[PDB]
Amino acid sequence: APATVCGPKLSTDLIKNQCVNFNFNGLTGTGVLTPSSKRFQPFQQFGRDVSDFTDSVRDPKTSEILDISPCSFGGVSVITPGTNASSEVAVLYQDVNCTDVSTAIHADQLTPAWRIYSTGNNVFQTQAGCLIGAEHVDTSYECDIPIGAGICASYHTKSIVAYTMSLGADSSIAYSNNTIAIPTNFS
C-alpha cells in the first residue's frame, strides 16, 4: 500500500545512474534506475516483470514512476592464441555493451577486478558483447577464433585482430550457352 509504518532510516534521492543499492520500502537489490512511462493506478505501487521480479516501483516520497533494469551482468570470455605459441595478452569479452563497461572500467565498477590491465584502448562493440582488447581490422581472412555474429578473432597485424568473417574465397565461373569444362589431369 502507501507505505505506512517506516523505519528510522533517512531518505536519500534517486539517481538515473546504473547500479544503485535501492531500498524502496524494504525492497533491496541493485540496478539501473531509469524513469519510464508506466500507468500505475494509485492502488498499485509495485510493478513486476512477465514473471515475478521487482521491476518498477513508485518512489514513495516523490510519487514518481520508474522501472529497474538490473546491473549489467553476463559472461566474460577471454580470447587467446596458444601460450606456447604466444603468451601475448588476452583480449576479452564483456557481454553487455561498449559504453556501459568502458565507462565502468575507469574505476572499480566491475568485479573481476584485474590488477594490471592496460585496456581499454581498442574497444570495439559487437552483437555478442563488447570485445575490449582486440584491434578491429576490416580485412577478412578466415575464422580462427569464433566471436559472434560473423566476426572472429585471430593473431595477425603481431596483434589480435577482430576481423569480420570472410566466406571461403571469390570464384569467377561463367554460365554460358555452349561452354562445358571437363578436366584432363587428376590428383
Binding site: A1, P2, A3, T4, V5, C6, G7, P8, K9, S11, T12, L14, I15, N17, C19, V20, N21, F22, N23, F24, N25, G26, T30, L33, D59, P60, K61, T62, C71, S72, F73, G74, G75, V76, S77, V78, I79, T80, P81, G82, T83, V89, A90, L92, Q94, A104, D108, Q109, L110, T111, P112, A113, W114, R115, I116, Y117, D144, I145, I147, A153
Partner: protein
Amino acid sequence: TTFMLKYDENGTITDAVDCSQNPLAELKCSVKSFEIDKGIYQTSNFRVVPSGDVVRFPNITNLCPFGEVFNATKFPSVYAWERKKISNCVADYSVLYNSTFFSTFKCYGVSATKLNDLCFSNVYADSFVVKGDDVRQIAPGQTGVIA
C-alpha cells in the same frame, strides 16, 4: 585473492598464478592449466554496485506509536482483544527490542534485528491477557488449547 599454486611431483611449489592479475591469468585458474590452447573460455564474473538509495515514505514523520500500547494500562480479555491501527508513525523496534521487558518474544515471520529497517502498510497490536499455560500456545498452529 584466489591464487593457483603449482606443486611439483616431488612436492615443491615451483610456479604460481595470481587469479586477478591478468585475464590471461584469469583463464589459467579457470581451466586449471598453464599451457592454454588457442581459443575462447569463460570466467563469468561481473559488475559491482557503486551507490545506494534508501529513499522511503514519510514527509510527516511521526514517531513511537506503540509506547501507548505496551506502557498503556488497560488490556482487555482473551476473546475481547483490541486491534489497534497505526498510521504514519515511524516505529523504532530497536528501542523495543534491546530493553528486555518480555518473557516470550517468538518473533515469527520476520526477525527483530532486521525488523528495524523495513517498512510496512499497517501494524496491528492485538492485545490480550492469558493464563500462563497458553503463552506458548499463541503461535501459528498450537490449536489444541481453548485460548
